Amino acid sequence: TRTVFVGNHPVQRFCDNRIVSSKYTLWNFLPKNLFEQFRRIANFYFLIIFLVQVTVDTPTSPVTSGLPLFFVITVTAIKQGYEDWLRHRADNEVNKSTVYIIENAKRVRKESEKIKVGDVVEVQADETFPCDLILLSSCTTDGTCYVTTASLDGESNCKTHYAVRDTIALCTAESIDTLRAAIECEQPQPDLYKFVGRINIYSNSLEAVARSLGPENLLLKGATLKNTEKIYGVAVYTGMETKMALNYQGKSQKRSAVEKSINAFLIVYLFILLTKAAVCTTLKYVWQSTPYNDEPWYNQKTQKERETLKVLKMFTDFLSFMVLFNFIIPVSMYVTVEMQKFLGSFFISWDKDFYDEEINEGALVNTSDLNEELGQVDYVFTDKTGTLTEKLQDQAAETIEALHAAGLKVWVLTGDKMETAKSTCYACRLFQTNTELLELTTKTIEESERKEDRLHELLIEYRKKLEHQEYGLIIDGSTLSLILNSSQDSSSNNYKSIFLQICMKCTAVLCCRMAPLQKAQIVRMVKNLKGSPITLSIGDGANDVSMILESHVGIGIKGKEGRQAARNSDYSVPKFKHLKKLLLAHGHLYYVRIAHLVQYFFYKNLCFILPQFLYQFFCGFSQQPLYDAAYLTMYNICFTSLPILAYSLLEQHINIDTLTSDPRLYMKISGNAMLQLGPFLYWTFLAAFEGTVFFFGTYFLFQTASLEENGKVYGNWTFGTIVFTVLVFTVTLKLALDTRFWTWINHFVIWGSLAFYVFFSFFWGGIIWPFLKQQRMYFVFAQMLSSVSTWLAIILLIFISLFPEILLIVLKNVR
Amino acid sequence: RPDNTAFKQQRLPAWQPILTAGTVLPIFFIIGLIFIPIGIGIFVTSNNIREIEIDYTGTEPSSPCNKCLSPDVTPCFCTINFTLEKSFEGNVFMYYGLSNFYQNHRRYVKSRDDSQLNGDSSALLNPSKECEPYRRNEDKPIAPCGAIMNSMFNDTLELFLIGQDSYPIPIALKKKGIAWWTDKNVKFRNPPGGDNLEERFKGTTKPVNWLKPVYMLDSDPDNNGFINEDFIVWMRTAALPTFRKLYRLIERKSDLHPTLPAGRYWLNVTYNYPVHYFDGRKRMILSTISWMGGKNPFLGIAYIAVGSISFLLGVVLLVINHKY
Ligand SMILES: *[C@@H]1O[C@H](CO)[C@@H](O)[C@H](O)[C@H]1NC(C)=O
Ligand code: ALF
């Protein structure tokens, strides 16, 4: 379809060898990064609430609500800018390189990104090709060349491509002799094994030689040349069209399995907050309809609240209620998760078990956002040569047994022929003796609709009737290519459906002769089939870098080939016997900590802002915050935001020395259990109960007219302080009951939170500075605890609140 | 080479507690055994405390002074007979409650300038702009600004004991000792300028609803301005639509006779504060005090219920837990 002129001479519209893998342009990084960030539902609600606080009314200071929204936007943006500059600087080293070309009867040396379609390139021994050449000649006769495609298929066996026959005579000898030629090729395709072209070399006067081309004459990019002095090609594909840059697909934005449940929780609390605000406003304007409940001769708007329009004050009051019940959704659950992840990614790096003495290095964490997804994996799309076999690895069999025991389903997407990738798999225990292979290789599917009947015979009458451990499939790049690319022929009986059912119903699967992209197609179908089974992929070489970018958490291994598939991996382990300890002892703990941190960061604020709403019924719906103006600001900062951080950062749900010895445990947190609809309603019905107990059990306590032996009344700030003491004590004792790994830091931080709450209540009230425009809470906390019935009421409430947990323990224990 | 610090290797020393059925069950019995006695204690103490509430808001011709539910702009009086069945022995405290008086409103709980009431020479002549619209009257600043101090409760309640004969006997009511010590001694101080009070408030003006400036509340040199016990106990907000502010302290006699012997009394009230507009009700609560505070049954019932529902649940789980 495309006509290229070998000598480029008569008798343009194509890219010039510029691989561009980056995403953000240097100039428009911000106008794109901020628009990609502020599209989310959380990072935009935070901005709406910040603007409302700055415009209409704020109980707290605007800074304590818009300062976190800056540390969260400046840190994620810096992360993304750096992981983009890395690919910028890594593509700069692939372009702007040295590649010699025969410009005009001489050997000019340009930069790889300046090569245009249709010019005789040159390549010395052991040089990655600059572009998809077409072997034209060679210093030696026979027109042969020994290419080793280590960066495409991933195997290192010496292939051999034959140069054009009639052109073997051109070896630096007048190769610029207006060489008549015109290669009519086909549009660029990712097949990597099919290429149909033709040469039309013209002689002195005119020639009609038409030497049809094939895959034997095609020299892809990224295939080092072995055992040869020099060659001569003619770039046919170059830049974003070569067969090595066609099998990339690009990198998607990876979001953990938790960062979606946090988003569902936030989208439910948005509705809870809106319901609270709307119901409070409606009840406020149904209450102020009584002539004498607004301005009853003892408090009267000056003139502005009398003249202000009716329909604008309704909106201003709705906004005041929203801003006042702002705390339901915590912006302190992101500035905390940042630190949690940044500090938790170090325990995967330092761990002394990830140390290989040969290479003398350890693990590596390239992204700190997928830690919480090491304990959710369901599949493992391995790679045969280099990862499994280096003669299997040290423990390449016991690790696969541990990965079959924990519930995972290990596949093998290799790149070698079916003859050898089958024997190894038969040694790794992936194929036991009594495993009836369902071989769908191209050696048995020599037809178009034949495999159509193969799939029916296999599914509708062989396997779909069920013995779940007997069958193990096998495929090739010639059969799966049809199965997938031609999956738009039948829709009443979908091919891809029949095939995916067979694959997901077998014990283990294999795939021989797999091009780089077909791996990403398999790991893109598996990510979509029937929900979202979290997939994993563990490659070693620069050909796996596609499924490592398409999987959910792509683990990369640091092997003999190089660091081209480790620097694009979300992690790094220099072995395969590590993939057990990595995703059994570091996935379980990380997911447990993150799930409990989220559940608690939502419960600790619902229980905090429920009373501050219930109170609106005993006020005149006037938006009077029950608590003081310093407690609303300090709760999430110092009072109860210290403990959960230390818990999330160091707490073993189950001692790790037992997590890796019994891989059965990984099945308790497999289906995202710890954040499903069950526990989310157990934590939203514990907060919505403690937040009513606190309030009403203090309200009933204030029906006595006095609480001191000397008979003195208590204001409306002692209401707030009693409820806040009860609240802090309860939401710290809940975590002190939930924590089951008590280090020297957990005792310290937990008990220190309570001791500091007490000392701060004492020190904030008791000294007039004065720099406060108001003396509301001067001596409230001392005169409050100077009574004998207050201690008793509080010790009764901190137990009526913790009753549900102590009961669930005693019941979720026996039977 | 490998950094083996016992912290980084995730192998710190831990407690790893094991709490379950056989180790928490005795807790559901200790709770009951330590919550039933305290429950009965604070339900008998809150039961042996006497009090009385004499509403005198009027609202019905059948009241002693419904005559003043709609009177002329002059001082009013009542006489609300009340009788005590069993006299009071300890110290007796006289409160004055209200109803449907939202002293916790937002537009109301902030209507005050704390710097001023704390005695800031500057603020005394330039109160803040939050205590509006009671900030300045007659192009001058009000001494106590804000809607809180403006609407102070200005009723006068007085008890008279009717002895064997019709001669009414007055009772000793002391005003000192009703406001928090912390605040009256420190939070509320008179302006520093000079010693005599009338010259400290030079650019000031009594509140609008008030009838006498702040330097004439009481002649007593220690109860004269910005620290008047009643004024303070009113400047503390209510926290609910129905509150009860300490009014006077009746001291127990030296003799063993009851502070308020049983019989009939007179409640001579100088009606001034009108609370019929907003469907409110005033009343006088005469009550004694005990170690834990006034008469309130809640705490007792709550402790008893918690102790019992802990003991019963513990026994139930113990029976079933033993049953396996
Ligand atoms: C008492 O206060 C009320 C309400 O502010 C006021 O209307 C009345 O005139 C006052 N009466 C006095 C000062 O005796
Ligand atoms: F063994 Al491979 F890509 F097939 F590393």
Coordinates of C-alpha atoms in Angstrom, one line a residue, chain B residues 32-309:
Chain B
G32 CA -22.3 -5.7 86.7
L33 CA -20.9 -6.0 90.2
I34 CA -19.3 -2.6 90.0
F35 CA -22.2 -0.8 88.3
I36 CA -25.2 -2.1 90.3
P37 CA -23.9 -0.7 93.7
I38 CA -22.9 2.7 92.2
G39 CA -26.3 2.7 90.4
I40 CA -28.2 2.2 93.6
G41 CA -26.0 4.7 95.4
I42 CA -26.6 7.5 92.9
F43 CA -30.2 6.6 92.5
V44 CA -30.9 6.8 96.2
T45 CA -28.9 10.0 96.6
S46 CA -30.8 11.5 93.6
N47 CA -34.0 10.3 95.3
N48 CA -33.4 11.7 98.7
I49 CA -33.0 15.3 97.4
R50 CA -36.0 17.6 97.7
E51 CA -37.1 20.5 95.4
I52 CA -40.1 22.4 94.2
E53 CA -41.1 24.4 91.1
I54 CA -43.6 27.2 91.3
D55 CA -44.5 28.5 87.9
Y56 CA -45.7 32.1 88.1
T57 CA -45.8 33.1 84.4
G58 CA -49.6 33.6 84.6
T59 CA -51.2 32.6 81.3
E60 CA -54.5 31.7 83.0
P61 CA -57.1 33.9 84.9
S62 CA -56.9 31.2 87.6
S63 CA -53.4 32.4 88.5
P64 CA -52.6 34.6 91.5
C65 CA -51.3 37.4 89.3
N66 CA -52.6 36.9 85.8
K67 CA -53.3 40.6 86.4
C68 CA -49.8 41.3 85.3
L69 CA -49.7 39.1 82.2
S70 CA -50.6 42.4 80.3
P71 CA -50.0 45.4 82.7
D72 CA -48.9 49.1 82.4
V73 CA -45.3 50.2 82.3
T74 CA -44.8 50.3 86.2
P75 CA -43.4 47.8 88.8
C76 CA -45.7 44.8 89.4
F77 CA -46.1 42.4 92.4
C78 CA -47.6 38.9 93.0
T79 CA -48.1 36.5 95.8
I80 CA -47.8 32.9 94.9
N81 CA -48.6 30.8 97.9
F82 CA -46.6 27.6 98.2
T83 CA -46.3 25.1 101.0
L84 CA -43.5 22.6 101.8
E85 CA -44.5 19.2 103.0
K86 CA -41.2 18.0 104.4
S87 CA -38.8 20.7 105.4
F88 CA -35.2 21.1 104.0
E89 CA -32.3 20.4 106.3
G90 CA -29.0 21.0 104.5
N91 CA -28.2 24.1 102.4
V92 CA -30.9 25.2 100.0
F93 CA -30.3 26.9 96.7
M94 CA -32.9 29.1 94.9
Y95 CA -32.9 29.0 91.1
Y96 CA -34.9 30.8 88.5
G97 CA -35.7 28.8 85.4
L98 CA -37.1 29.8 82.0
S99 CA -38.7 28.1 79.0
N100 CA -38.5 28.4 75.2
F101 CA -35.8 31.1 75.7
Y102 CA -33.2 30.2 73.1
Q103 CA -30.1 31.5 74.8
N104 CA -27.9 29.2 72.7
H105 CA -28.9 30.8 69.4
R106 CA -25.9 31.7 67.1
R107 CA -27.0 35.3 66.5
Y108 CA -27.3 35.5 70.3
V109 CA -24.4 33.4 71.9
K110 CA -21.8 35.6 70.1
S111 CA -23.5 39.0 70.9
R112 CA -20.8 40.1 73.4
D113 CA -17.4 41.7 73.5
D114 CA -15.2 39.7 75.8
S115 CA -12.3 42.0 75.8
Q116 CA -14.5 44.8 77.1
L117 CA -16.0 42.7 79.9
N118 CA -12.4 41.7 80.8
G119 CA -11.6 45.3 81.4
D120 CA -9.6 46.6 78.4
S121 CA -9.1 50.4 78.7
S122 CA -9.3 50.6 74.9
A123 CA -12.4 48.5 74.3
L124 CA -14.4 50.3 77.0
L125 CA -14.6 53.3 74.5
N126 CA -14.7 51.2 71.3
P127 CA -16.5 47.9 71.7
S128 CA -16.3 45.4 68.9
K129 CA -18.6 45.3 65.8
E130 CA -20.0 41.8 66.5
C131 CA -22.3 42.8 69.4
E132 CA -24.8 44.4 67.0
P133 CA -27.3 46.0 66.8
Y134 CA -26.8 46.8 70.4
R135 CA -23.4 48.4 69.8
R136 CA -23.9 52.1 70.0
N137 CA -26.9 54.2 71.1
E138 CA -26.9 58.0 71.0
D139 CA -23.6 58.0 69.1
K140 CA -21.9 56.4 72.2
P141 CA -20.8 52.8 73.1
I142 CA -23.0 50.8 75.5
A143 CA -21.0 49.7 78.5
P144 CA -22.0 46.0 78.3
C145 CA -22.6 45.6 74.6
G146 CA -24.3 42.7 72.9
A147 CA -27.8 41.1 73.2
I148 CA -26.8 38.9 76.1
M149 CA -26.2 41.5 78.8
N150 CA -28.9 43.8 77.3
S151 CA -31.7 41.4 78.1
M152 CA -30.6 40.5 81.6
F153 CA -33.3 39.0 83.8
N154 CA -34.5 41.8 86.1
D155 CA -37.1 40.2 88.3
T156 CA -37.0 40.3 92.1
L157 CA -38.1 37.2 94.0
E158 CA -38.5 37.3 97.8
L159 CA -39.7 34.6 100.2
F160 CA -41.6 35.2 103.4
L161 CA -42.2 32.6 106.0
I162 CA -45.8 32.7 107.4
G163 CA -45.3 31.7 111.1
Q164 CA -48.0 30.4 113.4
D165 CA -49.8 33.7 112.9
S166 CA -50.3 35.8 109.8
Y167 CA -47.1 37.8 110.4
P168 CA -44.9 37.0 107.4
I169 CA -41.3 36.2 108.4
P170 CA -38.5 37.0 105.9
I171 CA -35.8 34.6 105.0
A172 CA -32.1 35.4 104.6
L173 CA -31.0 35.3 101.0
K174 CA -27.3 36.0 100.2
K175 CA -26.3 37.0 96.7
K176 CA -22.5 36.3 97.0
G177 CA -21.3 32.9 95.9
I178 CA -23.6 32.3 92.9
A179 CA -21.2 33.0 90.0
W180 CA -18.2 30.9 89.0
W181 CA -15.1 31.9 91.1
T182 CA -12.8 31.6 88.1
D183 CA -14.7 34.3 86.0
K184 CA -15.9 36.8 88.6
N185 CA -12.4 36.9 90.3
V186 CA -10.6 37.1 86.9
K187 CA -12.6 36.8 83.6
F188 CA -14.8 39.7 84.8
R189 CA -13.0 42.8 86.0
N190 CA -13.9 46.4 86.2
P191 CA -12.1 49.0 84.0
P192 CA -8.7 49.9 85.4
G193 CA -8.9 53.7 85.0
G194 CA -9.1 55.2 88.4
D195 CA -10.8 53.8 91.5
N196 CA -14.3 55.3 91.6
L197 CA -16.7 53.6 89.2
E198 CA -18.8 56.4 87.8
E199 CA -15.7 58.0 86.4
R200 CA -14.4 54.8 84.8
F201 CA -17.5 54.8 82.5
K202 CA -17.3 58.3 80.9
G203 CA -18.1 57.5 77.3
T204 CA -20.5 54.8 78.1
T205 CA -24.3 54.3 78.1
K206 CA -26.5 51.8 79.9
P207 CA -28.0 49.1 77.7
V208 CA -31.2 50.0 75.8
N209 CA -33.5 47.6 77.6
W210 CA -31.7 48.1 80.9
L211 CA -33.1 50.8 83.3
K212 CA -30.0 51.7 85.4
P213 CA -26.4 52.1 84.4
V214 CA -23.8 49.4 85.3
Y215 CA -22.2 51.5 88.0
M216 CA -25.4 51.4 90.0
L217 CA -26.3 47.7 89.9
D218 CA -25.3 47.3 93.6
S219 CA -23.6 49.8 95.9
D220 CA -21.5 47.1 97.5
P221 CA -17.9 48.0 96.4
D222 CA -17.2 44.4 95.4
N223 CA -20.4 43.7 93.5
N224 CA -20.9 46.9 91.5
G225 CA -19.9 46.6 87.9
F226 CA -19.1 43.9 85.3
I227 CA -18.9 41.5 88.2
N228 CA -22.4 41.7 89.6
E229 CA -23.1 38.0 90.5
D230 CA -26.5 38.0 88.8
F231 CA -25.0 39.8 85.8
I232 CA -22.3 37.2 85.5
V233 CA -24.6 34.2 86.0
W234 CA -26.7 35.7 83.2
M235 CA -23.7 36.3 80.9
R236 CA -23.1 32.6 81.0
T237 CA -25.3 31.0 78.3
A238 CA -27.9 28.3 78.8
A239 CA -27.1 25.5 76.4
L240 CA -30.7 24.5 76.0
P241 CA -34.2 26.1 75.4
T242 CA -35.0 25.5 79.1
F243 CA -32.4 26.5 81.6
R244 CA -32.2 27.3 85.3
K245 CA -29.8 30.0 86.6
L246 CA -28.7 30.2 90.2
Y247 CA -30.4 33.2 91.9
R248 CA -29.6 33.1 95.7
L249 CA -28.0 30.8 98.3
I250 CA -29.8 30.2 101.6
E251 CA -27.3 29.2 104.2
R252 CA -28.1 26.4 106.7
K253 CA -28.8 27.7 110.2
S254 CA -26.3 27.1 113.0
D255 CA -29.1 25.3 114.9
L256 CA -30.3 21.9 113.7
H257 CA -33.6 23.4 112.6
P258 CA -34.4 23.1 108.9
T259 CA -33.2 25.9 106.6
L260 CA -36.7 26.1 105.3
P261 CA -39.2 24.7 107.9
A262 CA -42.3 23.0 106.6
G263 CA -45.5 25.0 106.2
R264 CA -46.8 27.8 104.0
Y265 CA -44.9 30.7 102.4
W266 CA -45.3 33.8 100.3
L267 CA -43.6 34.3 97.0
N268 CA -43.6 38.1 96.5
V269 CA -42.3 38.7 93.0
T270 CA -41.8 42.1 91.3
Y271 CA -42.8 41.1 87.8
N272 CA -40.7 43.0 85.2
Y273 CA -39.2 40.5 82.8
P274 CA -42.0 39.7 80.4
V275 CA -41.9 36.2 78.9
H276 CA -45.4 35.8 77.6
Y277 CA -44.5 37.2 74.1
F278 CA -42.5 34.2 73.1
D279 CA -44.7 31.6 74.8
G280 CA -42.2 31.3 77.6
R281 CA -42.6 30.5 81.3
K282 CA -40.7 31.6 84.4
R283 CA -40.6 29.7 87.7
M284 CA -38.7 29.5 90.9
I285 CA -36.9 26.2 91.9
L286 CA -36.1 25.7 95.5
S287 CA -33.8 22.7 95.9
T288 CA -31.1 21.3 98.2
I289 CA -27.8 19.8 97.0
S290 CA -25.9 16.6 97.7
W291 CA -22.5 15.3 97.0
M292 CA -23.2 14.6 93.3
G293 CA -25.5 17.6 92.5
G294 CA -29.2 18.4 92.3
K295 CA -32.1 15.9 91.9
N296 CA -31.6 14.0 88.7
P297 CA -32.8 10.3 88.3
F298 CA -31.2 9.6 84.9
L299 CA -27.7 8.6 86.2
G300 CA -29.1 6.0 88.6
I301 CA -31.4 4.4 86.0
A302 CA -28.6 4.3 83.4
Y303 CA -26.1 2.7 85.8
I304 CA -28.6 0.2 86.9
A305 CA -29.7 -0.7 83.4
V306 CA -26.0 -1.0 82.3
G307 CA -25.1 -3.2 85.2
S308 CA -28.1 -5.5 84.8
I309 CA -27.7 -5.8 81.0

